[PDB]
Design an enzyme around this catalytic site. Structure first.
Site, PDB file in Angstrom:
ATOM      1  N   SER A  44       0.781  -1.304  -0.111  1.00  0.00           N
ATOM      2  CA  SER A  44      -0.021   0.003   0.120  1.00  0.00           C
ATOM      3  C   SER A  44       0.919   1.247   0.098  1.00  0.00           C
ATOM      4  O   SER A  44       0.237   2.394  -0.032  1.00  0.00           O
ATOM      5  CB  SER A  44      -0.891   0.092   1.189  1.00  0.00           C
ATOM      6  OG  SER A  44      -1.860  -0.922   1.334  1.00  0.00           O
ATOM      7  N   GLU A 143      -5.506  -5.367  -5.161  1.00  0.00           N
ATOM      8  CA  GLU A 143      -5.376  -6.546  -5.862  1.00  0.00           C
ATOM      9  C   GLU A 143      -3.682  -6.678  -5.999  1.00  0.00           C
ATOM     10  O   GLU A 143      -3.270  -7.741  -6.221  1.00  0.00           O
ATOM     11  CB  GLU A 143      -5.598  -5.726  -7.417  1.00  0.00           C
ATOM     12  CG  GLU A 143      -5.844  -7.058  -8.444  1.00  0.00           C
ATOM     13  CD  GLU A 143      -5.635  -6.280  -9.900  1.00  0.00           C
ATOM     14  OE1 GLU A 143      -5.390  -5.138 -10.247  1.00  0.00           O
ATOM     15  OE2 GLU A 143      -6.052  -7.218 -10.953  1.00  0.00           O
TER      16      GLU A 143
HETATM   17  C1  LIG Z   1      -1.426  -1.966   2.174  1.00  0.00           C
HETATM   18  O1  LIG Z   1      -0.236  -2.126   2.345  1.00  0.00           O
HETATM   19  C2  LIG Z   1      -2.653  -2.952   2.650  1.00  0.00           C
HETATM   20  C3  LIG Z   1      -3.598  -1.799   3.500  1.00  0.00           C
HETATM   21  N1  LIG Z   1      -2.766  -0.807   3.981  1.00  0.00           N
HETATM   22  C4  LIG Z   1      -2.480  -0.986   5.253  1.00  0.00           C
HETATM   23  C5  LIG Z   1      -1.662  -0.196   6.244  1.00  0.00           C
HETATM   24  O2  LIG Z   1      -0.631   0.349   5.691  1.00  0.00           O
HETATM   25  O3  LIG Z   1      -1.696  -0.104   7.283  1.00  0.00           O
HETATM   26  C6  LIG Z   1      -3.379  -1.836   5.804  1.00  0.00           C
HETATM   27  S1  LIG Z   1      -2.066  -3.416   6.127  1.00  0.00           S
HETATM   28  C7  LIG Z   1      -3.009  -4.129   7.863  1.00  0.00           C
HETATM   29  C8  LIG Z   1      -2.287  -5.386   8.293  1.00  0.00           C
HETATM   30  N2  LIG Z   1      -0.991  -4.907   8.760  1.00  0.00           N
HETATM   31  C9  LIG Z   1       0.019  -5.441   9.332  1.00  0.00           C
HETATM   32  N3  LIG Z   1       0.741  -4.471  10.167  1.00  0.00           N
HETATM   33  C10 LIG Z   1       0.062  -3.403  10.000  1.00  0.00           C
HETATM   34  N4  LIG Z   1      -0.962  -3.666   9.145  1.00  0.00           N
HETATM   35  C11 LIG Z   1      -2.142  -3.125   8.732  1.00  0.00           C
HETATM   36  C12 LIG Z   1      -4.493  -2.388   4.751  1.00  0.00           C
HETATM   37  C13 LIG Z   1      -4.951  -3.846   4.723  1.00  0.00           C
HETATM   38  C14 LIG Z   1      -3.297  -3.059   1.410  1.00  0.00           C
HETATM   39  C15 LIG Z   1      -3.999  -4.764   1.491  1.00  0.00           C
HETATM   40  O4  LIG Z   1      -4.464  -2.088   0.810  1.00  0.00           O
HETATM   41 CL   LIG Z   2      -2.899  -1.469  -1.882  1.00  0.00          CL
END
Ligand SMILES: *C(=O)[C@@H]([C@@H]1NC(C(=O)[O-])=C(SC2Cn3cnc[n+]3C2)[C@@H]1C)[C@@H](C)O
Ligand SMILES: [Cl-]
Length: 265
Positions: A44, A143
């Site tokens: 992300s 995706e």
């Molecule tokens: C992006 O990388 C991800 C989404 N963005 C984030 C984020 O940066 O916090 C969450 S990741 C979620 C799981 N995790 C592990 N440590 C922290 N976090 C937060 C969402 C899902 C994609 C899937 O869009």
């Molecule tokens: Cl993403």
């Protein structure tokens, strides 16, 4: 204490994966890198550059920061915490882009790529336009997060991320009031407290954007750091592991950041 080369290598052995680092002390131009030109999945973290691209367009009078963006019929993507709240009313473009960054909002990201920035390839062309030849966005938000070893899609390098963050946050590409707005968005990011922020003294100001693919232990963070009484630092930390079920490590990212900050000083 040990040279960064030794500490980063031992950390990487512990982590059972790969760690990519690039950091810049903008007051000297000193840099520290490890795997700094190696591709790592963006996850992300590209959303922080999508937000900056929206602001570039606003500065150029190509978009209105306050135009209303309505999406009442959309099936919102998983992890859309802010666009979910506003589905009945819409959001301004600026507030939607802020949410793409600060909450990693997938609906905000994909609506802005569909309507304004020309999709993954448009986002990629924006990065080329500012001199980033490494970044590539091949799939849509959400995706893209497969993080398969060996796959070059949806990657950049720690160095190109750091250089692009520097360009976007510190006054090269964003020239008008939108530069301070972007810095404010980064400073209010909500998802990075256990990563680069954890490595920085509390009386330094930090802005960041995270990424966590949810597969192959793959996660990352990049940050602009404003120390007390010194020029900004840029820190870019990316990680991967080799088995789909491996989990990512916040403490490894924070540690790599600590090591990098020590090295550039
Ligand atoms: C992006 O990388 C991800 C989404 N963005 C984030 C984020 O940066 O916090 C969450 S990741 C979620 C799981 N995790 C592990 N440590 C922290 N976090 C937060 C969402 C899902 C994609 C899937 O869009
Ligand atoms: Cl993403």
């Amino acid at each position: 204490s040990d040279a960064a080369a030794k500490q980063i290598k031992k950390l990487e052995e512990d982590f059972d994966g790969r760690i990519g680092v690039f950091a810049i002390d903008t007051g000297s131009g000193n840099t520290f890198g490890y795997r700094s030109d190696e591709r790592f999945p963006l996850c992300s973290s590209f959303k922080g550059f999508l937000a900056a691209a929206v602001l570039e367009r606003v500065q150029q009078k190509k978009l209105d920061i306050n135009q209303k963006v309505k999406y009442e019929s959309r099936d919102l993507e998983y992890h859309s915490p802010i666009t979910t709240k506003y589905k009945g009313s819409g959001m301004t473009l600026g507030d939607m882009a802020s949410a793409a960054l600060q909450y990693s909002d997938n609906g905000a990201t994909n609506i802005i790529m569909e309507r304004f920035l020309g999709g993954p390839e448009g986002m990629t062309k924006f990065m080329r336009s500012i001199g980033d030849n490494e970044f590539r966005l091949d799939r849509w938000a959400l995706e893209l997060n497969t993080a398969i070893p060996g796959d070059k899609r949806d990657t950049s390098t720690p160095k190109a991320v750091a250089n692009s963050l520097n360009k976007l946050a510190l006054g090269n590409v964003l020239n008008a009031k939108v530069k301070a707005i972007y810095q404010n968005w980064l400073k209010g990011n909500t998802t990075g407290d256990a990563r680069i922020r954890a490595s920085v003294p509390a009386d330094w100001v930090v802005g960041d954007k995270t990424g966590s693919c949810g597969a192959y232990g793959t996660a990352n963070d990049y940050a602009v750091i404003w120390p007390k009484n010194r020029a900004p630092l840029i820190v870019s930390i990316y990680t991967t592991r080799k088995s789909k079920d491996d989990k990512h490590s916040d403490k490894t990212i924070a540690e790599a950041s600590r090591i990098a900050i020590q090295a550039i000083d």
